[PDB]
Nucleic acid binder design. Structure first.
Lengths: 49, 146, 299, 49, 49
DNA sequence: GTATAATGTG
């Protein structure tokens, strides 16, 4: 949202569409980082059920 | 500007310490300590112990103000290639690069000649660079890359 | 503290200048430089002219100082934009100051344009070149840095257009740079990992602690190599001593300098064609008897 | 200057040089000038003039 | 050989640094990007270290 | 090497 608000403050207002206004990179990056390095996302130990 | 000479920066402290005489100050502070004034006596005693430590040494206090920093051998700060061509190096290289760049830029500014404001800013940056090299967090905001 | 704060307090000590002020400053600088050139160019040195030129030089120094100090703040304004990359803010500010110093020695008042017009170009050039030169541990050519930045911008534009991170094939198609060079550039655009970073939470021992020397194997050079050398000094010596010297000079066991067939023949007085048969005899001998028993390993 | 001295507690530079920590930190980072020396002998001999 | 009676620590001076160093580092380059060799007068130069 | 014009962080 920070990136989006900066972009809409700078980008032209005539031919603007939300498709060119959203930036999906940070959210996917955050999700992947959480699932990869977060200390609460651990390998499921599978010695037995 | 014909009698008194003064300047700002670490060079000024170098000059001041060079002009300062340790033995004479030690004798005067011993004279002061010989009196009472307990409130000021503790501070006088701490200063006296430091000054006497310098006095008995036979060396000079100028060693505190550096004019040439050393660099450890590269094996102590190795730069190795990990599998996949992903280089790995110690932050000592980054700190030394900062110091070298600041020093070279300072030399370039002095050679070219510029108003004293920019030169003073460059000298301050170099001082901060050396400070960050010798210790991080010992003064001010620590540097962080990642 | 806050060295940025003290510099920004100092920079504002002087106010900006209007068009007429900058024009007159440029005129003063022109007069100063003209006097500087004349002072050493003149074959006959005038006496009062000497004093006049000295005063003019002082005034010209003051004029350059005033112009640079007045226009400094543009340096901060332009440098604030490039932050977030490798170099800090003050480094970029100093780079821009150097660029401004470079620019000021070319400004002209006849054109009539404002100084910032001719200053922003050089400030941006200096800042970008300095960032490309002294912002990465492994320095890269300026053209290669430009290509890496081009690849990054192309990727970001493709992501913006398609809403998803561009594929490698589509990156090659859009940029036209083959996948090989794209992979090379991607490999050249990664900050080296710091060895002091804790690894595996294994007592937070740094990565540097787990890197093998990768060379100088103890046992290999300790026993195997030296014992091979000694057994060779025994075996090759057990051959004809003349042939032992021939081998020493042929490969360079003692003094390097592997003697070619013709050279060794000249040294021994023999012909270039004999050395092939000599080597054939040596290799035949080395492959039989206790020599093979000793030297079957090491291959 | 070596960081270990003008920043340590006690700051050996401050104790030896009888300068308060605030003044020392200001002087080191090019904040305020300092009068290193003065021709006191000439000033005294020329006190009348 | 191994006759170490005492081990003292002193405050190094500029001349000590000068005379206990075998070269001067005059450029910031560490290693060449393509040939993987130390660069002249760099932090890894063979001439120095 | 550049000339609309820009003139103090985060």
């Amino acid at each position: 949202e920070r990136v989006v608000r900066e972009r809409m403050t700078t980008q032209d207002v005539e031919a603007i569409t939300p498709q060119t206004l959203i930036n999906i990179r940070p959210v996917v990056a955050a999700i992947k980082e959480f699932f990869g390095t977060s200390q609460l996302s651990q390998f499921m130990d599978q010695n037995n059920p | 500007g014909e009698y008194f000479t003064g300047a700002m920066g670490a060079e000024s402290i170098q000059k001041l310490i060079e002009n300062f005489d340790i033995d004479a100050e030690a004798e005067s502070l011993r004279d002061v300590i010989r009196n009472g004034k307990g409130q000021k006596k503790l501070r006088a005693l701490k200063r006296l112990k430091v000054v006497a430590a310098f006095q008995q040494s036979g060396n000079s206090p100028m060693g505190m103000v550096l004019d040439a920093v050393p660099v450890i051998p590269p094996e102590l700060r190795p730069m190795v290639q990990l599998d996949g061509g992903r280089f790995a190096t110690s932050d000592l290289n980054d700190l030394y690069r900062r110091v070298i760049n600041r020093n070279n830029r300072l030399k370039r500014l002095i050679d070219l000649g510029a108003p004293e404001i920019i030169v003073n800013n460059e000298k301050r940056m170099l001082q901060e660079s050396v400070d960050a090299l010798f210790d991080n967090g010992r003064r001010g905001r620590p540097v962080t890359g990642p | 503290a806050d060295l940025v704060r003290v510099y920004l307090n100092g920079i504002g000590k002087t106010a900006l200048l209007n068009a007429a002020g900058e024009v007159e400053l440029a005129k003063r600088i022109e007069a100063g430089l003209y006097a500087e050139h004349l002072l050493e160019t003149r074959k006959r040195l005038g006496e009062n002219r000497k004093r006049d030129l000295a005063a003019v030089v002082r005034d010209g120094e003051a004029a350059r100082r005033h112009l640079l100090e007045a226009n400094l703040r543009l340096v901060v304004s332009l440098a604030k934009r490039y932050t977030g990359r490798g170099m800090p803010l003050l480094d970029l500010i100093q780079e821009g100051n150097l660029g401004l110093i470079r620019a000021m020695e070319k400004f002209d008042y006849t054109k009539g344009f404002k100084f910032s017009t001719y200053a922003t170009w050089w400030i941006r050039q200096a800042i970008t070149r300095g960032m490309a030169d002294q912002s990465r541990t492994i320095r890269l050519p300026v053209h290669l840095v430009e290509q890496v930045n081009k690849l990054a911008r192309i990727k970001r534009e493709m992501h913006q257009h398609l809403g998803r991170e561009a594929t490698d094939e589509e990156l090659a198609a859009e940029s036209g740079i083959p996948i090989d060079k794209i992979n090379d550039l991607l490999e050249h655009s990664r900050d080296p990992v710091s060895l002091d970073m804790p690894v595996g939470s294994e007592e937070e021992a740094p990565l540097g602690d787990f890197i093998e020397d990768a060379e100088a194997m103890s046992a290999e050079n300790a026993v195997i190599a030296e014992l091979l050398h000694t057994d060779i000094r025994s075996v090759l010596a057990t051959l004809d001593e003349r042939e032992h010297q021939v081998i020493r000079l042929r490969f360079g066991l003692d003094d390097g300098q592997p003697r070619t067939l013709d050279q060794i023949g000249k040294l021994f007085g023999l012909s270039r064609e004999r050395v092939r048969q000599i080597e054939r005899d040596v290799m035949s001998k080395l492959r039989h008897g206790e020599r093979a028993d000793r030297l079957r390993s090491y291959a | 200057t070596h960081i270990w001295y003008f920043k340590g507690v006690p700051s050996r530079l401050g104790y030896l040089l009888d300068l308060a920590p605030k003044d020392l930190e200001k002087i080191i980072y090019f904040a305020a000038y300092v009068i290193t020396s003065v021709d006191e002998e000439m000033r005294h001999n020329e006190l009348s003039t | 050989v191994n006759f170490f009676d005492e081990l003292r620590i002193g405050l190094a001076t500029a001349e000590d640094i000068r005379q206990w160093s075998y070269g001067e580092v005059k450029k910031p380059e560490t290693i060449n990007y393509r040939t993987l060799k130390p660069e002249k007068d760099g932090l890894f130069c063979e001439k120095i270290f």
